[PDB]
PDB file of C-alpha atoms (C1' of nucleotides) in Angstrom:
ATOM      1  CA  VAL A   1     -80.832  76.504  15.382  1.00 25.31           C
ATOM      2  CA  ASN A   2     -84.721  77.012  16.674  1.00 24.49           C
ATOM      3  CA  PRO A   3     -85.937  73.208  18.476  1.00 26.58           C
ATOM      4  CA  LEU A   4     -89.619  74.836  18.058  1.00 27.72           C
ATOM      5  CA  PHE A   5     -88.993  74.540  14.679  1.00 33.80           C
ATOM      6  CA  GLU A   6     -90.847  70.497  13.378  1.00 33.41           C
ATOM      7  CA  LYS A   7     -91.172  69.370   9.643  1.00 33.74           C
ATOM      8  CA  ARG A   8     -95.351  68.965   9.901  1.00 32.64           C
ATOM      9  CA  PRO A   9     -95.495  65.810   6.888  1.00 32.58           C
ATOM     10  CA  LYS A  10     -99.241  65.519   5.033  1.00 34.96           C
ATOM     11  CA  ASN A  11     -99.546  62.642   3.752  1.00 37.25           C
ATOM     12  CA  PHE A  12    -101.632  62.162   0.660  1.00 38.64           C
ATOM     13  CA  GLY A  13    -103.373  58.676   0.905  1.00 37.99           C
ATOM     14  CA  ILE A  14    -106.897  58.471   0.935  1.00 39.66           C
ATOM     15  CA  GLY A  15    -108.682  59.694   3.087  1.00 38.15           C
ATOM     16  CA  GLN A  16    -106.573  60.707   5.866  1.00 39.60           C
ATOM     17  CA  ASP A  17    -106.265  64.343   4.504  1.00 38.66           C
ATOM     18  CA  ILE A  18    -107.065  66.569   2.429  1.00 37.90           C
ATOM     19  CA  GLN A  19    -105.420  66.713  -0.823  1.00 34.75           C
ATOM     20  CA  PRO A  20    -103.250  70.211  -2.298  1.00 33.69           C
ATOM     21  CA  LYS A  21    -104.133  72.618  -4.963  1.00 29.68           C
ATOM     22  CA  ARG A  22    -102.795  70.184  -7.981  1.00 31.84           C
ATOM     23  CA  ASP A  23    -103.045  71.183 -12.044  1.00 30.63           C
ATOM     24  CA  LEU A  24    -106.576  70.367 -13.200  1.00 30.22           C
ATOM     25  CA  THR A  25    -106.287  71.382 -16.649  1.00 31.44           C
ATOM     26  CA  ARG A  26    -106.772  67.573 -18.172  1.00 30.47           C
ATOM     27  CA  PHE A  27    -110.711  67.688 -16.651  1.00 31.15           C
ATOM     28  CA  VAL A  28    -111.592  71.115 -17.369  1.00 31.66           C
ATOM     29  CA  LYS A  29    -115.115  71.144 -18.251  1.00 28.90           C
ATOM     30  CA  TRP A  30    -113.906  74.105 -20.904  1.00 28.44           C
ATOM     31  CA  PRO A  31    -116.176  75.839 -22.962  1.00 29.49           C
ATOM     32  CA  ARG A  32    -118.654  74.743 -26.345  1.00 23.93           C
ATOM     33  CA  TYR A  33    -116.460  76.762 -28.611  1.00 23.53           C
ATOM     34  CA  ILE A  34    -112.431  75.348 -26.836  1.00 26.31           C
ATOM     35  CA  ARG A  35    -114.211  71.532 -26.952  1.00 24.88           C
ATOM     36  CA  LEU A  36    -115.154  72.095 -30.826  1.00 26.11           C
ATOM     37  CA  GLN A  37    -111.881  73.750 -31.589  1.00 29.81           C
ATOM     38  CA  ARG A  38    -109.695  70.068 -30.292  1.00 29.69           C
ATOM     39  CA  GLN A  39    -111.859  68.289 -31.581  1.00 29.33           C
ATOM     40  CA  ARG A  40    -111.961  69.509 -34.896  1.00 27.01           C
ATOM     41  CA  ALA A  41    -108.333  68.548 -34.202  1.00 27.92           C
ATOM     42  CA  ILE A  42    -108.711  65.524 -33.201  1.00 26.77           C
ATOM     43  CA  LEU A  43    -111.233  64.655 -36.781  1.00 25.74           C
ATOM     44  CA  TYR A  44    -108.494  65.354 -38.915  1.00 23.09           C
ATOM     45  CA  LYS A  45    -106.373  63.125 -37.857  1.00 23.53           C
ATOM     46  CA  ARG A  46    -109.027  60.314 -36.717  1.00 22.46           C
ATOM     47  CA  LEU A  47    -110.247  60.413 -40.372  1.00 19.31           C
ATOM     48  CA  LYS A  48    -108.843  59.242 -43.349  1.00 17.37           C
ATOM     49  CA  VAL A  49    -107.588  62.092 -45.074  1.00 18.64           C
ATOM     50  CA  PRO A  50    -108.529  62.408 -48.706  1.00 20.60           C
ATOM     51  CA  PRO A  51    -103.966  63.105 -50.548  1.00 20.74           C
ATOM     52  CA  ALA A  52    -105.340  66.847 -51.993  1.00 19.74           C
ATOM     53  CA  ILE A  53    -106.446  67.975 -48.661  1.00 18.50           C
ATOM     54  CA  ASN A  54    -103.746  65.740 -46.317  1.00 24.01           C
ATOM     55  CA  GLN A  55    -100.975  67.848 -49.152  1.00 21.09           C
ATOM     56  CA  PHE A  56    -100.871  70.850 -47.558  1.00 16.73           C
ATOM     57  CA  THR A  57     -99.885  69.065 -43.887  1.00 19.05           C
ATOM     58  CA  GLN A  58     -95.741  68.718 -45.655  1.00 17.24           C
TER      59      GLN A  58
ATOM     60  C1'   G B   1    -113.069  63.608  17.781  1.00 17.91           C
ATOM     61  C1'   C B   2    -109.059  67.335  14.337  1.00 19.61           C
ATOM     62  C1'   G B   3    -108.321  67.705   9.757  1.00 19.89           C
ATOM     63  C1'   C B   4    -107.909  73.694   4.309  1.00 18.35           C
ATOM     64  C1'   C B   5    -106.112  78.498   3.325  1.00 18.94           C
ATOM     65  C1'   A B   6     -97.862  73.280   4.066  1.00 21.84           C
ATOM     66  C1'   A B   7     -94.937  72.976   7.159  1.00 24.69           C
ATOM     67  C1'   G B   8     -89.688  71.044   6.640  1.00 26.17           C
ATOM     68  C1'   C B   9     -85.601  71.977   2.875  1.00 23.99           C
ATOM     69  C1'   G B  10     -82.985  74.718  -1.938  1.00 23.32           C
ATOM     70  C1'   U B  11     -82.202  78.946  -4.238  1.00 19.96           C
ATOM     71  C1'   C B  12     -83.134  84.201  -6.062  1.00 18.08           C
ATOM     72  C1'   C B  13     -83.452  89.822  -4.472  1.00 17.08           C
ATOM     73  C1'   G B  14     -84.119  94.660  -2.171  1.00 17.09           C
ATOM     74  C1'   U B  15     -84.436 100.522  -4.912  1.00 13.81           C
ATOM     75  C1'   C B  16     -84.042  98.421   3.286  1.00 15.78           C
ATOM     76  C1'   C B  17     -80.986  98.813   7.425  1.00 15.03           C
ATOM     77  C1'   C B  18     -76.361  96.834  10.434  1.00 17.26           C
ATOM     78  C1'   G B  19     -70.408  94.984  10.749  1.00 14.69           C
ATOM     79  C1'   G B  20     -67.547  90.949  -1.057  1.00 12.74           C
ATOM     80  C1'   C B  21     -70.093  87.875   2.455  1.00 15.16           C
ATOM     81  C1'   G B  22     -72.518  87.521   6.670  1.00 15.38           C
ATOM     82  C1'   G B  23     -76.534  89.218  11.165  1.00 17.64           C
ATOM     83  C1'   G B  24     -81.616  91.479  10.716  1.00 16.33           C
ATOM     84  C1'   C B  25     -86.037  93.183   8.691  1.00 14.93           C
ATOM     85  C1'   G B  26     -89.143  92.450   4.731  1.00 16.93           C
ATOM     86  C1'   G B  27     -90.370  89.438  -0.486  1.00 18.29           C
ATOM     87  C1'   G B  28     -89.569  85.405  -5.232  1.00 17.04           C
ATOM     88  C1'   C B  29     -89.855  81.408  -7.722  1.00 12.16           C
ATOM     89  C1'   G B  30     -89.475  75.593  -6.733  1.00 10.06           C
ATOM     90  C1'   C B  31     -89.366  71.001  -4.527  1.00  9.25           C
ATOM     91  C1'   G B  32     -92.834  68.595  -0.879  1.00  5.49           C
ATOM     92  C1'   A B  33     -97.759  67.266  -4.732  1.00  6.78           C
ATOM     93  C1'   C B  34     -93.072  63.030 -10.286  1.00  8.83           C
ATOM     94  C1'   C B  35     -92.857  62.308 -15.806  1.00 10.35           C
ATOM     95  C1'   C B  36     -95.210  61.875 -20.542  1.00 13.31           C
ATOM     96  C1'   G B  37     -99.103  60.558 -23.949  1.00 12.04           C
ATOM     97  C1'   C B  38    -105.539  64.283 -28.246  1.00  9.59           C
ATOM     98  C1'   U B  39    -111.096  62.557 -27.430  1.00 12.24           C
ATOM     99  C1'   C B  40    -113.462  65.207 -19.271  1.00 14.28           C
ATOM    100  C1'   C B  41    -114.468  59.454 -16.313  1.00 12.05           C
ATOM    101  C1'   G B  42    -117.204  54.573 -17.887  1.00 11.33           C
ATOM    102  C1'   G B  43    -121.092  52.463 -20.529  1.00 14.91           C
ATOM    103  C1'   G B  44    -122.836  50.950 -25.819  1.00 13.57           C
ATOM    104  C1'   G B  45    -122.242  51.398 -31.125  1.00 11.85           C
ATOM    105  C1'   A B  46    -122.673  52.262 -36.995  1.00  8.33           C
ATOM    106  C1'   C B  47    -126.933  49.322 -33.804  1.00  9.05           C
ATOM    107  C1'   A B  48    -130.436  52.107 -31.600  1.00  8.87           C
ATOM    108  C1'   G B  49    -132.433  56.339 -33.389  1.00  7.18           C
ATOM    109  C1'   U B  50    -133.941  60.252 -36.745  1.00  4.32           C
ATOM    110  C1'   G B  51    -136.177  61.400 -41.765  1.00  6.52           C
ATOM    111  C1'   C B  52    -139.082  59.411 -46.278  1.00  8.06           C
ATOM    112  C1'   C B  53    -141.130  55.321 -48.384  1.00  9.19           C
ATOM    113  C1'   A B  54    -143.716  50.610 -48.436  1.00 11.16           C
ATOM    114  C1'   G B  55    -146.958  45.879 -46.235  1.00 10.77           C
ATOM    115  C1'   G B  56    -149.906  44.100 -41.556  1.00  9.34           C
ATOM    116  C1'   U B  57    -152.302  45.864 -37.305  1.00  7.50           C
ATOM    117  C1'   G B  58    -155.529  49.611 -36.272  1.00  7.51           C
ATOM    118  C1'   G B  59    -164.259  50.637 -33.291  1.00 11.03           C
ATOM    119  C1'   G B  60    -158.625  54.520 -29.532  1.00  7.84           C
ATOM    120  C1'   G B  61    -160.506  57.820 -32.898  1.00  6.52           C
ATOM    121  C1'   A B  62    -163.375  60.170 -38.016  1.00  6.20           C
ATOM    122  C1'   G B  63    -166.810  61.185 -41.636  1.00  5.99           C
ATOM    123  C1'   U B  64    -171.410  58.288 -43.775  1.00  8.54           C
ATOM    124  C1'   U B  65    -175.392  54.589 -44.383  1.00  8.09           C
ATOM    125  C1'   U B  66    -177.751  51.078 -42.368  1.00  6.92           C
ATOM    126  C1'   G B  67    -184.531  50.699 -49.414  1.00  7.73           C
ATOM    127  C1'   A B  68    -189.071  50.373 -50.916  1.00  9.76           C
ATOM    128  C1'   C B  69    -194.866  48.448 -50.216  1.00  9.90           C
ATOM    129  C1'   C B  70    -197.278  47.557 -46.726  1.00 11.34           C
ATOM    130  C1'   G B  71    -205.757  47.738 -43.667  1.00 14.45           C
ATOM    131  C1'   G B  72    -199.328  52.017 -38.078  1.00 13.61           C
ATOM    132  C1'   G B  73    -195.195  50.549 -37.924  1.00 11.51           C
ATOM    133  C1'   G B  74    -192.963  46.016 -36.545  1.00 14.35           C
ATOM    134  C1'   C B  75    -192.021  40.882 -37.771  1.00 10.43           C
ATOM    135  C1'   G B  76    -193.433  37.405 -41.717  1.00 13.21           C
ATOM    136  C1'   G B  77    -194.620  37.483 -46.755  1.00 12.79           C
ATOM    137  C1'   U B  78    -193.070  40.492 -52.425  1.00 13.60           C
ATOM    138  C1'   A B  79    -198.294  40.731 -54.740  1.00 13.57           C
ATOM    139  C1'   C B  80    -191.004  45.783 -56.384  1.00 15.37           C
TER     140        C B  80
END
RNA sequence: GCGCCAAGCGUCCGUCCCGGCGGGCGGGCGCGACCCGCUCCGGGGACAGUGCCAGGUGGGGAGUUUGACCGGGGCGGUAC
């Protein structure tokens, strides 16, 4: 094997290195219509849904 | 001072070559860089705030008024 080859590890600690490109899907500033849809699903899980509307979950 | 655009591993290809495996040439994916959980993070919160009515305050502002007689008017008087 070639002795020139080497491991060059980078530690992603606080400071001392630049962070890699990781998934930011949980911290994206989504457009206002995506926010509207997702919050509307949360509201249906958060509020007291009356039985006549809740019976369609089943 | 320097710090990014991955090293290193582990696999999958070639309609590509040279002796099913090997070597060369060019690529792909995964780990490196853990997984799951519904609101980006934090601070308040059914209060603040907004809409409508009710009470107080309000020369900051608006509009108006501030009699008459009278040896001039005013002051004084009322002989109004």
